[PDB]
From TrEMBL, chain A:
Top EC group: oxidoreductase
Species whose genome carries this gene: Nitratidesulfovibrio vulgaris (strain ATCC 29579 / DSM 644 / CCUG 34227 / NCIMB 8303 / VKM B-1760 / Hildenborough)
Keyword flag Metal-binding: yes
Residues that coordinate or bind Fe(2+): E42, E268, I427, H481
Record-linked Gene3D superfamilies: Cytochrome-c3 Hydrogenase, chain B
Modified residues (Cysteine sulfinic acid (-SO2H)): C61, X475
Record flagged with keyword Iron: yes
Protein's UniProt name: Periplasmic [NiFe] hydrogenase large subunit
Gene giving rise to this polypeptide: hysA
EC numbers for this chain: 1.12.2.1
Binding residue positions for Mg(2+): E42, I427, H481
Cystine bridges: C61-C64, C64-C478
Automatic annotation (TrEMBL), chain B:
EC number: 1.12.2.1
Major location category of this protein: periplasm
CC per GO annotation: [Ni-Fe] hydrogenase complex; ferredoxin hydrogenase complex; membrane; periplasmic space
Entries under SUPFAM superfamilies matching the protein: HydA/Nqo6-like
Record note on quaternary structure: Heterodimer of a large and a small subunit.
Gene name in the database record: hysB
Name of the protein described by the UniProt record: cytochrome-c3 hydrogenase
Location(s) in or outside the cell: Periplasm
Record: residues binding [4Fe-4S] cluster 3: H204, C207, C228, C234
Keyword field: 3Fe-4S, 4Fe-4S, Iron, Iron-sulfur, Metal-binding, Oxidoreductase, Periplasm, Signal
UniProt cross-references to NCBIfam families, sorted A to Z: H2_NiFeSe_small (NF045520), hydA (TIGR00391), TAT_signal_seq (TIGR01409)
The reaction(s) this protein catalyses: 2 Fe(III)-[cytochrome c3] + H2 = 2 Fe(II)-[cytochrome c3] + 2 H(+)
Length: 481, 279
C-alpha cells in the first residue's frame, strides 16, 4: 500500500524546502520538492547602477556568496568590456577557491555527517529519529564527532582565507567589475598560505579518509539515488587570460553520452512553479520573473530549467564525472582496501556508484582534494604587489553573461544594461538545476528523480529521504532567489 | 547555570546570519552551542527534521513559556497571505513566517532580530520587491505583540555583535532577573534598536583614512590604499558600527581597507546607501 510522507522543513540544508514522497512496498515511487521562500532578486535589481549587482546578488545566499559575486562580476566584465589584469584574475581565484574549501567541509560535517554520526546528548544534536540507522562503531562515531568539532575551526579558517583579499565573509567586498579591489601583499600571501596548510592537512588526513570510511559502513548507499544519471558543467576557474582553459571544463553527460555544452539550449519552465504561465520556456537572455503564488497546480518557487529538454544535475559529481580527473592517492587506496575496487580516474567508480547517494559525498570529498592543487598553483602564480583592477566607465547600453561553477554546481548570471541601469538581470543557479519541480511535460527535477527507489523500510523513521536530498547539498536561497 | 533555550526562525534571509555566527572566534561556535545557549530549533544545523522538529520546538516553547529567546532572521513577507515564506508543515497545515511569528512571538522572553533584513527590511524590502517584506519590530507592533525586540543588524552582522548581545542580555538577567534585565538591555539600545556597545560609534570619525578625507586626498582606483575611499563610494560617514576596530574574520580585513563601506548596518540599506560605488 501507499504511504505519503511530507517533510517540511528539510533540515541540514540551506533554506526552505519541503519534500513529499510516495512510498510503496518499502521504496519511494514518487516525489515532489517545494522551495517555499521567494524574494525576487531579478526584479529588485532592475533600475540600479549595474555595479551594485555584485553586492546585491551575494545576498541570494550567504553560504555561496562568492559564486554569485564571481558570476556577477564576470557578466559585468563582459558587458562593460573590462579587461581584468592577470593578477586580478588569480586573486579572484584565491578568494573564490577558499570558499569551495569552506563550503564542502561545512556540507560534509555540519550538514551531512549527522546522517551517519550520533552527536552529543544536547540540542541541536537531539532529539532525532528513534531509529536513525546510525551504524558506526563507538570509535568511528567518536572520530566523526571529533572531526565535526575540528571542522568548525577549519571552515572558519577557510573564511579567513576568503577575507584576506575579499574583505569579509559572508559577502565579499573584494570582487568588482574590472578585477579585485586589493592587491595581494607578500605579508598577506604568507598569512593565506599558513591557513591553507592547516586546511590542506585536515582535508588530506581527516576529511577525504572519513568519507570513504563512513561510506564503507553504508555500502548500500552506493546502490540508490541514481536518478537520471545526467549531468551539467558550464566551466569554471580561468587558468589563463585567454579564456581557453579552466580548472573545470564544460560538458554535458546524459544517456551514457558526453556532449558539448551550448547555453542556447537552456530553457526555464514554470507549469509546476509559482510564476505567470506566459513566462514559460524562456532562455535566460529573455528571462522574466513574474510571481504567481496562487497559481493552481504549482508547488514550488523554483523554476524548472531543462537542457535541450533534459533534466540534469549539477555539483561536484557532475564536474568530476564530466572532467574525469585522477582520484586522490588516499581515495585510490581506500577504494581498494575498504571496497575491493581498483580505480585510477573518477569514472572508474562506474556510472552506478558515482551517481548515487554516497557517490555524491565521495565526489565532493575528491573535488576538495582536487581544489588543493589548484589553490597551490595559484599561490605560486600570483605576484605580490601587481595591480589587480581596472576602473571602467559604466556603459549606457550593453549585455553580458557570466558562467561559473558554484560549490553546488553550474551558475550563470545575465545582465542587460539600458540607459546606464539594469534593464534585466537573470540568474540560473546550481540548486535550481538540482531541486526544481516538474517541467511542462511532467518530467521530474534531478533530485525528485533521484529519490525514486530510495528505501523506506520503516515509514516511522524514513531517514533515507532527507539523506538523499542532503547528498546534493541544496541551498534554496540560490534555487529561488 | 542552565543555558537558555533558543529557537532560530528564518524568514526571507540568506542564512548569512548563521554562517557569520559559525565564524565566531571568542567564544568559538562549539562553545556557544555547548556552553552558552541551548539551540533547540535551527533548521540549518539540527539533527531532526520536518514536523518532528516543529513539534520539538512547540514542546520546548510550552515548557519555557515566556522564557525562551527567539532569533528571527530575514524579513517577514505579508503579501499573498504569507505564502512567500513557508517555514514548515505540521498536521497537514503549512506554517508561514507570518504564522510562526504570531505563534512564538508573544511567548518569547525577547526577540532578537538578527541581520538588516529582520531589523529593518533590507534587500527583500528594497525597491523592485513585491512580497510585502516587513521588519520584525513593525510586524510585531502591527499585530499587537509587545515582546521586547533587540535589533542586531548588518548584512551580515559580525558574529561578535550577535554573541555579544546575547551575553549583554545574560549578564543583565543574572543581575536583575528576566523582566528587570531586559529593561536594562533596552536602556542601552539606540533609536534604531541597536546595542550601543557595538553600534554606538561612527565608522568615519574613527577611520584611519580620516586625515586623507580632510585633506581631500581620494583614491581613484580601489587598489590605491593610501587615499580616502569616499569618491569610490564609501558610506562610512553615515554608518554606525565598530568594524574599524574589531574588523572581520579573525581581524584579517575589513570593508574600508579592502574596498568601501556599503553601510550594511543602517536602516536604509540598501537603497539609501546606493549606488554603492559613487558618493
Ligand atoms: S569616507 Fe570616511 S575617511 Fe574616507 S570612513 Fe570612508 S575611507 Fe574612511
Ligand atoms: S558597516 Fe562593512 S559594510 Fe557593513 S560590515 Fe560598513 S564596514 Fe561594517
Ligand atoms: N554553491 C552554491 Fe549557490 C547554489 N545552489 C549557487 O550558484
Ligand atoms: Cl561560493
Ligand atoms: Fe532565476
Ligand atoms: Ni547557495
Amino acid at each position: 500500500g501507499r504511504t505519503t510522507i511530507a517533510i517540511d522543513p528539510v533540515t541540514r540544508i540551506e533554506g526552505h524546502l519541503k519534500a513529499e514522497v510516495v512510498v510503496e512496498n518499502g521504496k519511494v515511487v514518487d516525489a515532489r520538492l517545494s522551495g517555499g521562500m521567494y524574494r525576487g532578486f531579478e526584479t529588485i535589481l532592475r533600475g540600479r547602477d549595474p555595479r551594485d549587482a555584485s553586492q546585491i546578488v551575494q545576498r541570494i545566499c550567504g553560504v555561496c556568496p562568492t559564486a554569485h559575486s564571481t558570476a556577477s562580476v564576470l557578466a559585468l566584465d563582459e558587458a562593460f568590456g573590462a579587461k581584468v589584469p592577470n593578477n586580478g584574475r588569480i586573486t579572484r581565484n584565491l578568494i573564490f577557491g577558499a570558499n569551495y574549501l569552506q563550503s564542502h567541509i561545512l556540507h560534509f560535517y555540519h550538514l551531512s555527517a549527522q546522517d551517519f554520526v550520533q552527536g552529543p546528548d544536547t540540542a541541536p544534536f537531539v532529539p532525532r529519529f528513534p531509529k536513525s540507522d546510525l551504524r558506526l562503531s563507538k570509535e568511528l562515531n567518536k572520530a566523526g564527532v571529533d572531526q565535526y568539532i575540528e571542522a568548525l575551526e577549519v571552515r572558519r579558517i577557510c573564511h579567513e582565507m576568503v577575507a584576506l583579499f575579499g574583505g569579509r565573509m559572508p559577502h565579499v567586498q573584494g570582487q568588482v567589475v574590472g578585477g579585485a579591489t586589493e592587491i595581494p601583499t607578500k605579508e598577506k600571501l604568507v598569512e593565506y598560505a599558513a591557513r591553507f596548510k592547516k586546511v590542506r592537512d585536515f582535508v588530506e588526513q581527516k576529511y577525504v579518509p572519513v568519507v570513504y570510511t563512513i561510506g564503507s559502513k553504508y555500502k548500500d548507499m552506493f546502490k540508490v539515488g541514481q536518478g537520471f544519471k545526467a549531468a551539467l558543467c558550464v566551466g569554471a576557474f580561468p587558468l589563463d587570460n585567454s579564456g581557453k582553459k579552466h580548472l573545470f571544463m564544460p560538458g554535458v553527460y546524459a544517456k551514457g553520452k558526453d556532449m558539448p555544452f551550448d547555453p542556447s539550449k537552456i530553457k526555464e519552465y514554470v507549469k509546476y512553479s509559482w510564476f505567470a504561465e506566459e513566462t514559460t520556456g524562456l532562455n535566460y537572455k529573455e528571462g522574466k520573473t513574474i510571481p504567481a503564488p496562487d497559481k493552481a497546480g504549482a508547488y514550488s518557487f523554483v523554476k524548472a530549467p531543462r537542457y535541450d529538454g533534459l533534466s540534469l544535475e549539477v555539483g561536484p559529481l557532475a564536474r568530476m564525472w564530466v572532467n574525469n580527473p585522477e582520484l586522490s592517492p588516499v581515495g585510490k587506496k581506500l577504494l581498494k582496501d575498504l571496497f575491493g575496487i581498483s580505480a585510477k580516474k573518477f569514472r572508474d567508480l562506474g556510472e552506478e556508484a558515482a551517481f548515487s547517494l554516497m557517490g555524491r559525498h565521495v565526489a565532493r570529498a575528491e573535488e576538495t582534494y582536487y581544489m588543493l592543487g589548484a589553490i597551490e598553483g595559484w599561490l605560486k602564480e600570483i605576484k605580490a604587489g601587481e595591480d589587480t583592477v581596472v576602473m571602467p566607465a559604466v556603459p549606457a547600453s550593453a549585455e553580458g553573461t557570466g558562467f561559473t561553477e558554484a560549490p553546488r554546481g553550474s551558475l550563470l548570471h545575465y545582465v542587460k544594461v539600458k540607459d546606464s541601469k539594469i534593464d534585466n538581470y537573470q540568474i540560473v543557479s546550481a540548486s535550481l538545476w538540482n531541486c526544481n519541480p516538474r517541467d511542462d511535460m511532467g518530467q521530474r527535477g534531478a533530485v525528485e528523480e533521484a529519490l525514486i527507489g530510495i528505501p523506506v523500510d520503516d515509514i516511522q523513521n524514513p531517514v533515507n529521504v532527507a539523506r538523499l536530498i542532503r547528498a546534493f547539498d541544496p541551498x534554496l536561497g540560490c534555487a529561488v532567489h | 547555570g542552565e543555558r537558555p533555550p533558543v529557537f532560530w526562525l528564518q524568514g526571507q534571509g540568506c542564512t548569512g546570519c548563521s554562517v557569520t555566527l559559525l565564524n565566531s572566534v571568542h567564544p568559538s561556535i562549539a562553545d556557544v552551542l555547548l556552553k552558552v545557549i541551548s539551540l533547540e530549533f535551527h533548521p540549518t544545523v539540527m539533527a531532526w527534521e520536518g514536523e518532528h522538529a516543529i513539534e520539538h520546538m512547540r514542546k520546548v516553547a510550552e515548557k519555557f513559556k515566556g522564557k525562551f529567546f527567539l532569533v528571527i532572521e530575514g524579513s517577514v513577507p505579508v503579501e499573498a497571505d504569507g505564502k512567500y515564506c513557508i517555514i514548515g508543515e505540521a498536521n497537514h497545515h503549512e506554517i508561514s513566517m507570518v504564522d510562526a511569528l504570531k505563534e512564538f512571538g508573544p511567548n518569547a522572553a525577547a526577540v532578537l532580530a538578527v541581520g538588516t533584513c529582520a531589523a529593518y527590511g533590507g534587500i527583500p524590502a528594497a525597491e523592485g520587491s513585491e512580497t510585502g517584506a516587513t521588519a520584525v519590530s513593525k510586524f510585531l507592533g502591527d499585530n499587537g505583540i509587545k515582546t521586547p525586540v533587540v535589533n542586531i543588524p548588518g548584512c551580515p552582522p559580525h558574529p561578535d555583535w550577535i554573541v555579544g548581545t546575547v551575553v549583554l542580555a545574560l549578564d543583565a538577567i543574572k543581575k536583575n532577573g528576566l523582566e528587570g534585565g531586559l529593561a536594562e538591555v533596552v536602556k542601552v539600545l539606540d533609536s534604531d534598536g541597536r546595542p550601543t556597545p557595538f553600534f554606538g560609534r561612527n565608522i568615519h570619525e574613527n577611520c584611519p583614512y580620516l586625515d586623507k578625507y580632510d585633506e581631500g586626498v581620494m583614491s581613484a582606483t580601489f587598489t590605491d590604499k593610501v587615499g580616502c575611499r569616499y569618491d569610490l563610494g564609501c558610506k562610512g560617514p553615515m554608518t554606525m558600527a565598530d568594524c574599524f576596530e574589531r574588523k572581520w574574520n579573525g581581524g584579517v580585513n575589513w570593508c574600508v581597507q579592502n574596498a568601501v563601506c556599503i553601510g550594511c548596518v543602517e536602516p536604509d540599506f540598501p537603497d539609501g546607501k546606493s549606488p554603492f560605488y559613487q558618493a
